């Protein structure tokens, strides 16, 4: 089984402050033949279904908004958001798809500071 | 009808789509037991052996074309697509060299005798016939044709307890 | 007049009375000791290697250019072939190509059909380079083109150079047969291995190319079928891989 | 963008059966598809994937000897089965479809299994 | 490459049938009601129709076994104590007298053989060779009675075998003694030629080959729709 | 690919009222082999996971009420409840999982009559 | 092989319509083969039947014998079977369908019309 | 003194000179052509059948009672073994059965293991009927018991009356041999086909039961060790299957 | 219990006391009617041999002693203490130098067919074992260990006038 810590805690910041995070990997990441690193950044919006922001930590998926950046290289993984929004609630997760099992993250959730 | 005998073949363009398909228990599938082998086999209640097939082409002289026949052991399941069938055991068929194609289906079965009254479905092998090309003709010739199948017996059988036919029904006595 | 093979016991093929024309001179055989940069004496599997493994039919229009094929990875997920592919590292094997086209007598044509060996392409843009995923699909032929063609990372097309470079006119020096539908309907190529090592892995190495293209055009009249259909089947001969035991 | 749907939520009881299907909208070639569990209290959790095209079914260790995996191609149907049905494992079950080696792209709709004993 | 000697022709043909069940009485009544007659032909018993009609000629002997249970009759005057039950058991060959009643003098020619059985012994057999004209007897025939092209279609006079008629030979003043008869037919030294195809469509009549049109086979699905199918398993994964 | 049709709309009833509902497959769901019905009806809160009622058909969930019970034997397949709720909206499906693929239902939502 | 012996024995039974004078019983004993038609009534078409040998048999001679040899499909009959019916690993546990004998079906011939004989 | 054997060239084993006990007399062999009741000729698998499977080892207390494995379902998921009683119909197989402890001179005891024949086994609750998942496990051993079980649909385990309802005093009258730790620490059993049809399926039919039963208790001292391991080897012989080709 | 078939020696200082002693009758003994030789020999009314008794001696490899198995004839009467037993015939069976100690009883008889329902009790024979020494062990070993006790058959039996089995009790038929 592999693994990964998120943050500690939740964003906990105000509306419209850039975020910085990271996810703590327990193993590496990189597979050194194709230079990929297998590890995505979702998104759960409350209710209904999840969906993942960037995959592989340095292609953003095609729909998704310029204002996450997805990086990070090796076993750890960081994310960044220029604008944080009041309607981007959901349980930020950093998951794995290297090898079995497709493990999760450990979730963020979207506080009030207002 | 008489349509009934006639596998049609059409033209056009069939990408790898699939001609016809059967699973291969004479005396109980529905395709089988009403032919000589079927109706003789459903008098006895034990019988075993391998059954031979004969394929002919009913077409234009002047068409030509390929076909795939595939079939699948006792224990498989019938390929989806026309890879899986060459994958496992087939015979590519060419209606341009040759008219017939024959193909002996063996008996391997764990006991010695197979009985008509047996609840043995997927467990019986299949075989298919998949379309490796299409038909292509010179132009005058019909762009559609027809195959026309045989089944009989090969060398070896065995029937063992003789038993009344299902398929007389009435225990009346005619006047 | 006509001849039934059978290799493999599963597989049953008719041909006519026809030319056939051995590669280079040289017929396919296994590996003598003579010749060896390894140690692990190779497995010989050959009870299902050795069978007619046809392929999809394909349509020969008005305006159709040409198709070509890669050997080996053509056979990428045939059956066996691919298994061995797949779970060996190194290996070695002569193919046995059969070319046949279904047209009536009012038809009219002429094809060439040859073995490029190391058939190295170009691309279309020619500062860029080319990628694994437009030089050839997995068992589906790659048409040739009349025109020029312009994208970033694809093999170029125009068939009267062959995608090689060279004069398609000259491509008879390597084995090759004609297919006229006037008087013949069918080839039959056998091809060696043919390489600088005598043992390479399928996945990385093309050994070769087979090429169909027209030279003269089909025509017809208005009642009659739009297409000519060709079949290609192949029959692996003398395969050899690497062992897995210890010594 | 592609929908996806499932057999449906459904009032079940404990120790009887209850099989949850996922509809298809692709192909059947070297794909994968595969489920998690929705619990607040457990987080998220797989439960087994199933791969199109490989005939590869696994389940995960907390579950490996109580759940099995079944599904048919041509019918565009997948089955996970469950066996000892607790009343704890109630959840709202994801269809996760990928159509990589290794990705995770189209979510599912939503299914509840809550039984009362 | 195993054996075959159970789809003979003697073992596939030579199995005792039952092909009649009647029952006569022993006292006063309808004449016709105190005796039990038979026409000797094959073309009664469907299951054994659809046997031999698997052959156009066939040539053998055939043996006959009689059944005969009596049981005393309900009413009045019922006898105390009766001796025995006497049966008469007669074969008419072709063209020989036949009754017309009981206490007839047919019942005693001397070209007719007959048995006589009395209750509690094993049951009466007897056996007829090959009585006929021809050299065989045929199952099919395309043809007339009269070469005039008229007459009855389908009818040979070269395949009669008789007639079995049975009756009480006691004379019963007390009562009455009703009986039952089974009839068990066998052939025995069958020949067979010339094999036809089996049939297909119902019988409609014992006298002709009449029939309803039938469908050649059972219906399917569709013409690529093997036999059911098998969910997913351990196996299937 | 096998798909099952569920009823043509929602339930659209009152609150308290029991509902029967009916699910029309297209295929045989039964194999003979074992008697057992491949099928289960579900249940997915919006915004949340889904979950079903009953699996194959005769054994309801552990956990589930008894309001809930499963019937229908071969293609057609129902179900019954005594006592609606308007605290279980949720999309009802009759997902199938017989064989490839797991497909899902038609989908029924539980609307507003009061 | 199976030598089977059948010892019938007669009486007459108390009511009202008593017999003063009866000929004789006959009695009917029919052995089946396994797979063979099984009457469910007295006076059924199956007691007819010609694959099942029968014995007819008159009060007042010696008892009625009858041997069947090995009649099973294996090469012996088993008194203890580890196993199931189907392959599934499910079904009747330790039955085996190898070592069937058949059956035995006995009825009274006669139809009597005064009283009842048991 | 010591002897190493190899069979399937990837298995090896160690053993002393010690007493073999073969089966009722006779070796395991291949089906002739006098006995069948089939056609197909059978195909012989014998390159990876034909090896030593080990089973894992079991402890033996002082106060364990005995175990039982059904056989051919205790190589189920055993390599080649298992796959070939997945993908087959018929089977055919003899087996070759090592049991080994590993005790000191000072501890003591005394064993039984037996190989019974179709062993039929009753059910706790007279009334029902036992259920496939309490006969055996896969690999696993199913242990006796001391006092009475009150299972509904578990087998009746009383190690005197051995499941069998029979006493377990006269079980020797099976293939059987005795490890007595005072002498011997070692045990062989060679078991043929046994049964009333020359070929069955291997999911449906048990062919045996293998019983180690300890009549003498463990006892040692209190400085040592609390168990003595017992370990038990499976080598298929002369196995076949039914055929899957055309004739 | 499986305790039945355990015969216990104790160590400690055992002076000249008993072991164990039985009778030799099979198919009436307690001790014999329930083993394969008294359960075969119980299904005749007449019956006649020797039989055979194998001891075997389950304890440590490191443990060291005596035993004096003593048999009297059918007309005497058991040994009391061990210099009786002595001075019949007896045998000194030493567990350190041998495991196993055989020894086949014979049949001597007046008629030539013993009953197995025959009332003939201090008429068939006793044998006993007793303590000639204790049983020494080196520190480390168990003070305490068994014997297991084997009774069959010799070359040389007869029986006569085969008869029911007292062991099945119920006539009622089952179902």
Chains 1, 6 share one sequence.
């Not at chain 1, 950044?41 to 204002?67: C, H, M, N």
């Not at chain 3, 058939?119 to 020619?126: F, K, L, Q, R, Y």
């Not at chain 3, 087979?210 to 055009?217: D, G, H, R, S």
């Not at chain 5, 049951?123 to 007897?137: C, E, H, K, L, T």
């Amino acid at each position: 089984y592999i693994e990964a810590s998120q943050s500690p805690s939740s964003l906990a910041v105000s509306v419209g402050e850039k975020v910085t995070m990271s996810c703590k990997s327990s193993q590496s990441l990189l597979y050194s033949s194709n230079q990929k690193n297998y590890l995505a950044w979702f998104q759960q919006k409350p209710g209904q279904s999840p969906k993942l922001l960037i995959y592989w930590a340095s292609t953003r998926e095609s729909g998704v908004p310029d204002r996450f950046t997805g990086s990070g290289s090796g076993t750890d993984f960081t994310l960044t958001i220029s604008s944080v929004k009041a309607e981007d609630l959901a349980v930020y997760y950093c998951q794995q798809y290297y090898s079995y099992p497709y493990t999760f993250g450990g979730g963020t959730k979207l506080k009030i500071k207002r | 009808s008489m349509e009934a005998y006639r596998i049609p073949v059409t033209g056009g363009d069939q990408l790898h789509t699939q001609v016809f398909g059967f699973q291969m228990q004479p005396g109980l599938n529905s395709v089988f037991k009403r032919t000589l082998l079927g109706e003789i086999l459903n008098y006895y209640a034990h019988w075993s052996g391998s059954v031979k097939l004969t394929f002919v082409f009913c077409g234009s002289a002047m068409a030509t074309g390929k076909f795939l026949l595939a079939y699948s052991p006792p224990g498989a399941s019938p390929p989806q697509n026309r890879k899986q069938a060459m994958l496992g055991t087939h015979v590519i068929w060419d209606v341009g060299l040759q008219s017939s194609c024959v193909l002996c289906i063996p008996w391997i079965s764990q006991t010695h005798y197979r009985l008509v009254q047996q609840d043995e479905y997927t467990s019986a092998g299949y075989v298919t016939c998949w379309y490796q090309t299409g038909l292509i003709v010179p132009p005058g010739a019909p762009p559609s044709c027809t195959i026309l199948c045989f089944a009989s017996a090969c060398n070896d059988f065995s029937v063992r307890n003789l038993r009344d036919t299902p398929f007389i029904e009435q225990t009346q006595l005619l006047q | 007049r006509v001849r039934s093979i059978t290799l493999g016991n599963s597989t049953i093929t008719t041909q006519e009375c026809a030319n056939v024309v051995v590669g280079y001179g040289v017929w396919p055989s296994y590996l003598q000791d003579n010749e060896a940069t390894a140690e692990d004496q190779p497995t010989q599997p050959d009870v299902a290697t050795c069978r007619f493994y046809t392929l999809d039919s394909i349509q020969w229009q008005k305006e159709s250019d040409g198709w070509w094929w890669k050997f080996p990875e053509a056979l990428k997920n045939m059956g066996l072939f691919g298994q061995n592919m797949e779970y060996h590292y190194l290996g070695r094997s002569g193919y046995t190509i059969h070319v046949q086209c279904n047209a009536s007598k009012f038809h009219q044509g002429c094809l060439l059909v040859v073995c490029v060996p190391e058939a190295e392409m170009g691309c279309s843009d020619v500062e860029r380079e080319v990628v694994a995923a437009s030089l050839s699909s997995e068992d589906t032929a790659k048409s040739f083109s009349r025109t020029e063609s312009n994208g970033q990372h694809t093999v170029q097309t125009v068939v009267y150079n062959a995608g090689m470079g060279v004069g398609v006119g000259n491509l008879t020096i390597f084995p090759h047969q004609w297919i006229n539908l006037r008087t013949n309907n069918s080839a039959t190529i056998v091809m060696p291995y043919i390489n600088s090592v005598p043992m390479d892995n399928m996945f990385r190495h093309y050994n070769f190319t087979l090429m169909i293209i027209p030279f003269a055009k089909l025509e017809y009249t208005e009642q009659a079928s739009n297409y000519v259909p060709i079949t290609v089947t192949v029959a692996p001969m003398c395969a050899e891989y690497n062992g897995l035991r210890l010594a | 963008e592609v929908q996806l749907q499932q057999s449906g939520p459904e009032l079940a009881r404990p120790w009887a059966s209850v099989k949850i299907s996922c509809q298809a909208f692709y192909t059947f070639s070297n794909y994968g598809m595969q489920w998690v569990k929705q619990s607040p209290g457990q987080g998220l959790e797989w439960i087994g994937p199933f791969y199109p095209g490989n005939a590869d079914t696994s389940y995960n260790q907390k579950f490996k000897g109580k759940a099995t995996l079944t599904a048919d191609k041509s019918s565009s149907t997948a089955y996970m089965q469950f066996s000892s049905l607790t009343s704890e494992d109630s959840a709202v079950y994801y269809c996760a479809r990928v159509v990589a080696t290794t990705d995770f792209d189209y979510w599912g709709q939503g299914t509840t299994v809550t039984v009362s004993s | 490459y195993h054996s075959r000697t159970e789809s003979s022709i003697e073992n596939f043909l030579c199995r005792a049938a039952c092909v009649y069940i009647a029952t006569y009485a022993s006292a006063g009544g309808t004449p016709t009601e105190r005796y039990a007659s038979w026409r000797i032909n094959t073309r009664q018993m469907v299951q054994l129709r659809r046997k031999f009609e698997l052959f156009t000629y066939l040539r053998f002997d055939m043996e006959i076994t009689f059944v005969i249970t009596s049981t005393q009759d309900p009413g009045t005057q019922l006898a105390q104590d009766m001796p025995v039950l006497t049966h008469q058991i007669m074969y008419i060959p072709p063209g020989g007298p036949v009754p017309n009643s009981a206490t007839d003098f047919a019942w005693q020619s001397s070209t007719n053989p007959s048995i006589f059985w009395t209750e509690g012994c094993a049951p009466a057999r007897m056996s007829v060779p090959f009585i006929s004209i021809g050299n065989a007897y045929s199952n099919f025939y395309d043809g007339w009675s009269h070469f005039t092209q008229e007459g009855v279609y389908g009818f040979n006079s070269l395949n009669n075998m008789g007639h079995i008629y049975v009756r009480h030979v006691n004379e019963q003043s007390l009562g009455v003694s009703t009986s039952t008869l089974r009839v068990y037919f066998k052939p025995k030294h069958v020949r067979a030629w010339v094999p036809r195809p089996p049939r297909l469509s119902p019988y409609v009549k014992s006298s002709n080959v009449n029939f309803k049109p039938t469908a050649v086979t059972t219906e399917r699905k569709d013409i690529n729709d093997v036999g059911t199918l098998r969910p997913v398993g351990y196996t299937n994964h």
